[PDB]
């Protein structure tokens with residue numbers, strides 16, 4: 555229900571650090587973490603890339619005094635209007651961030667704060683996100699347009715499935731914003747699920763809906779239903795990620811107008827051709843039945859018929875998954891980053 559001050563929330567975190575900003579020469583520091591650059595300005599959010607002891611870190615900034623001013627109508631239960639700030643949401647995220655500890659999820663290494671500014675230390679996943687988006691999805695650049703090899707995709711999927719197992723089953727947490735931006739790779743190349751800003755604790759394995767990224771939201775959000783199965787939601791979205799991994803494009807949900815999108819999802823059958831179908835089109839390999847056999851199991855409209863994560867993990871498709879395929883993929887991909 556209602557949550558206390560930031561201090562109450564962090565009151566059980568055993569690695570809370572007092573803020574110390576200082577300047578040494580031509581450099582700005584946060585507690586021995588040297589500021590290299592800000593990786594993205596999510597207007598709010600904000601992730602700062604730092605160095606400390608020859609290691610790269612990613613510290614997410616958060617500002618109470620900015621976040622508590624940004625407030626929207628949430629509409630109550632009692633006809634008397636309620637109102638949530640983006641600081642309320644952050645208090646929820648803090649709780650979760652405060653208890654995610656898992657090798658397949660991006661886990662904070664410590665939290666720096668004065669109880670207004672918060673810098674949350676994470677490892678920097680040097681191979682960046684799975685895919686990036688600009689007009690469309692790509693791996694590295696966009697004059698060069700390569701698709702992730704199917705052997706690599708298997709691992710990625712298996713890995714986030716292992717993330718799912720922990721958050722759903724050990725933690726009772728639904729991610730809610732499973733998305734390529736949120737699937738991260740290190741140089742080595744492990745895959746972690748990241749960003750719990752829309753994630754929430756489940757009640758009887760369910761969430762109250764409408765939250766996350768529009769085109770990764772499942773058909774049920776568009777139904778009669780007031781509550782949804784958390785796992786099945788996360789599964790759908792991983793389904794979209796897989797579809798994106800196949801084609802470098804989102805299924806039926808191709809932006810512009812959302813009515814177009816929202817009218818589609820619940821009603822539309824997805825097109826399942828071969829890799830570059832959607833893609834020779836804005837530019838002036840193959841897929842087998844089995845690849846698509848498997849993706850369809852993710853994107854079934856009735857969530858009760860939608861694959862569980864258990865039956866996905868031990869499906870014949872991921873049976874021949876080889877961690878080495880991803881490792882080699884990652885090692886060469888990192889070599890391309892060592893200057894582009």
Ligand SMILES: CC(C)[C@@H](CO)Nc1ccc2ncc(-c3ccc(C#N)cc3)n2n1
Nearest residue numbers: 593594612676677678679682683735748749
């Ligand atoms: C938008 C990008 C700046 C961002 C998210 O896709 N990319 C990256 C790239 C490397 C990396 N290493 C750690 C992190 C990172 C750390 C924390 C969060 C959170 N919450 C989200 C991402 N990240 N995030």
